[PDB]
Symmetry: C2
């Protein structure tokens, strides 16, 4: 027998008409779903490319799930195929993560469809909170690392639209419609704080301040993006408490850029908390 | 060999208490002032590092002036030394470009202090327009290539502040004061459109759309920044027309990223325009 039981799986998606690749390390009935960033590749999830996540969670009593693909998808269900880059199907990542994938993992890998953690970064930080907001039994724990937490507000729909076009030529209009469309507020974590409060979801929200430490990530884009989204994260913390939120961890250290070393540092930092919440 | 060899000059700046390096190619009494970007280095101007600007303007009948230095300076006069990065003097780049350098080049080279062109890109695109707005006799011609043309509006002071801190740890408030200080609107090209109209300045405004061509610059930050400032540039064009502006060239082709190959293409494109306005 091998060492770490890392697997590479093909999970059929009826909604997207294709098999979705999923990296997996079985290690318990509850799992940590590690969502990727905006530039998600079709071969491997960014957590396995850039961090020791599997090694760090090996023997933790938790399974680790790293879905592969979904560049610029926001792990959401889109209204239509991305208009412009020739995408030939409609992304239905929320349907995949909440219905198709958990059903398949339950049947084939013994993973419970309920009582899991959604952990996202950058693009998927907001996705993790939205998944927990609407599917609280599946995700009683959600972590957002350097997420964009008020996507429907001010300049955010415009900036997100630019970033999606930059990463693969995807079109935000095909995803959630123009910014006036209800889908923008439906998928906005700040707007959905009342749901996170009502469900008493355990949330772990992190955002650095743009100053690199010994961990690295010292480049202008990483510094810029972290400083740009920190304000929104602080407003989210404030709004969460004002709205009766009482189950959140907010880490806003005096360091950190929008890069993998810091996201990995937080994944390690939250392990005991996830073990406590999901496994008792 | 009109204006050869290209020369590296040391021009004293009384206002900054130091000598400013200037790359210079002679060739005529009127000159093109080629301003650098946000990451201006202290050894050579970005136009020389990245483009064949001098060779392209050789024998054009125009001298070419490339000031060296001024990282994150916006080619403006700052209120005080940048607070945070140890700067030990106050940038006074508007005084240098409008008084000190032209006096030196007139006395020693015969370059006229009047009737020149200010050409800037990125950070200095707005600087070029502001220099022409306030010093029309010196600059009857100004070009802004992918400039940030409404710096005092909305999220711009915040974004410029982040970018300046990312490029050398410079402080936007040391430059133009708190965002309520008059210096922000004073140095905002959109706000100063009435002066550009009153002076009948010849303006050349370019901005790409974020889509790379075979010219290159195919990276996410270059794509993002270009698509972000395009919106402001389009608003600038509309406001200029609405305010009676009738002496501008607006180039918004369906390609281009925030990178040197496109700025060079525009510099070559505008040569005949500058020659006609300044020499004929």
């Amino acid at each position: 027998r091998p060492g770490l039981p890392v697997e590479y799986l093909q999970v059929p998606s009826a909604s997207m008409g294709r098999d979705i690749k999923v990296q997996f390390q079985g290690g318990g009935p509850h799992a940590v779903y590690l969502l990727d960033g905006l530039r998600a590749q079709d071969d491997y999830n960014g957590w396995d490319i850039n961090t020791p996540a599997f090694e760090e969670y090996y023997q933790s009593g938790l399974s680790v799930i790293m879905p592969v693909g979904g560049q610029s998808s926001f792990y959401t269900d889109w209204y239509q195929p991305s208009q412009s880059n020739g995408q030939n199907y409609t992304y239905k990542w929320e349907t995949f993560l909440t219905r198709e994938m958990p059903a398949w993992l339950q049947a084939n890998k013994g993973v419970s469809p309920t009582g899991n953690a959604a952990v996202g970064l950058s693009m998927s930080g907001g996705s993790a909170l939205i998944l927990a907001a609407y599917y609280p039994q599946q995700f009683p724990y959600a972590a957002s690392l350097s997420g964009f937490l008020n996507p429907s507000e001010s300049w955010w729909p415009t900036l997100i639209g630019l970033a999606m076009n930059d990463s693969g030529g995807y079109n935000a209009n095909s995803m959630w419609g123009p910014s006036s469309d209800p889908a923008w507020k439906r998928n906005d974590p700040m707007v959905q704080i009342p749901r996170l409060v009502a469900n008493n979801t355990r949330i772990w929200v992190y955002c650095g301040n743009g100053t690199p430490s010994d961990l690295g990530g010292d480049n202008i884009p990483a510094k810029f993006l972290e400083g740009l989204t920190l304000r929104t994260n602080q407003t989210f913390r404030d709004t969460y408490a004002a709205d009766g939120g009482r189950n959140g961890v907010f880490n806003f250290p005096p360091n950190g850029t929008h890069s993998w070393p810091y996201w990995n540092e937080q994944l390690v930092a939250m392990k005991a908390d996830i073990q406590h919440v999901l496994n008792g």
